[PDB]
From a paper:
The CTLH (C-terminal to lissencephaly-1 homology motif) complex is a multisubunit RING E3 ligase with poorly defined substrate specificity and flexible subunit composition. Besides the reciprocal incorporation of Wdr26 and muskelin, another known alternative assembly path of the CTLH complex involves the mutually exclusive incorporation of the Armc8α subunit or its shorter isoform Armc8β (673 versus 399 residues). The remaining scaffolding subunits, Armc8β and Twa1, strongly interact with each other and with RanBP9, again with nanomolar affinity.
To identify possible oligomerization sites, we solved the crystal structure of Armc8β after crystallization of selenomethionine-labeled protein by single-wavelength anomalous diffraction at the selenium edge and refined the structure at a resolution of 2.7 Å. The crystals contained three chains (denoted as p, i, and a) in the asymmetric unit. Remarkably, each copy exhibited a distinct conformation, thus demonstrating dynamic flexibility of Armc8β especially at its termini. Chains p and a are more similar as reflected in an rms deviation of 1.04 Å after superimposition of the Cα atoms of all modeled residues, whereas chain i adopts a more compact shape; in this case, the rms deviations are 2.82 Å for the ia pair and 1.69 Å for the ip pair. In terms of oligomerization sites, analysis of the structure with the PISA server detected no significant stable assembly, which is in line with the dynamic nature of Armc8β′s oligomerization behavior. Apparently, the high concentrations in the crystal promoted the observed interactions, nevertheless, since chain p shares an interface with both chain i and chain a, it is tempting to speculate that these two interaction sites could correspond to the two sites identified when analyzing the self-association of Armc8β by SEC–MALS. However, in our structure we could model an additional short α-helix at the N terminus. Human and mouse Armc8α are very closely related (overall identity of 98.51% with only two substitutions in the crystallized region), and the C-termianl extension, which is unique to Armc8β, is very flexible and therefore could only be partially resolved (5–9 residues). It is more likely that structural differences arise because Armc8α is being present in a complex, whereas Armc8β was analyzed in isolation.
Residue numbers in the entry: 14 to 336, 343 to 389
Amino acid sequence: LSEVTASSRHYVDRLFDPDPQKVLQGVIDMKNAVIGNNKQKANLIVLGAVPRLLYLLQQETSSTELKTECAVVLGSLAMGTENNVKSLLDCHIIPALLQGLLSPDLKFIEACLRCLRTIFTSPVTPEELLYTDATVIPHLMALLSRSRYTQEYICQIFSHCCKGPDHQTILFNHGAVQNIAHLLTSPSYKVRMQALKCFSVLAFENPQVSMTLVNVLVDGELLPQIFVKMLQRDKPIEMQLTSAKCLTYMCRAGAIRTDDSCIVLKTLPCLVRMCSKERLLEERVEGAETLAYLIEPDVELQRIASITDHLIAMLADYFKYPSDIKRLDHDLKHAHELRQAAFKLYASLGANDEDIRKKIIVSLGEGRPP
Ligand SMILES: [Cl-]
């Protein structure tokens, strides 16, 4: 490791200072020292700052300011390497943060939830820890709608830690769909985005939840009506793609009909707009694969898609060379993903109609099949 120098030790020592004012300023200086330095994070974790910080956040005498600043620093350490997250987990930070979530003060709750978000988002953290203690999910649900930060953080934690049907149903029984639906009308886009993500992963292959989503009412509008608005071009591209995913999944589960207006006039047209040359490579791959997921079961959708906004022409441009230098290198390295996506959509488009396969064969290269 990098040698530990007197500066780092002085930061950790100032926490043990006898004057409370000096301790508070020491934790503040510690937060300002780990902003960009992952090495400073590692040095302070090895010097034992995390146990002391947790103790200072546990004390009854500690002011709300000191508790908030200590939680902030603990989150800043969790923003570093995976080794740091493992060290913080080994110091039992999640239990302490869960006790901190019992606080009335909102800023302190936000700091603890920010730390929990970074931890649960990190790969080294097992998702089962979220469900190992049954009371944490109800407690998080209760805090879901106190601030935009609680909404965003708890949505991120849930969306990253759902993991499919079993504990997805655990989350559902605690009122996930009803409590998270209201966030889609929030004045904060960051919230509205994250809620969307929660729904997309929550309804991927769970027909039961999809049906529930069809009848959920948020601010006088049925939830699919909110999704359709989030397909509009004025909205950000992410918002659109994710909305389309939700609807396609709801359509695949049976909650929405393949002949429904939201699918043929909004969702599918939106997905072809994701396949344009102007779109990013990742967006083209996801739009194409999601459209293939949508159109695979129904022949009528396949035909409609084949005649929508020169889709088969745009797909041909997946095989053409790109036309910011790091993005260009990234697009030449990941071009295989784009070509593979094009073939997935071709396979779904031409599954039942030979004339569509003839159209694609002609589009992919010069020459007409016999
Ligand atoms: Cl942050």
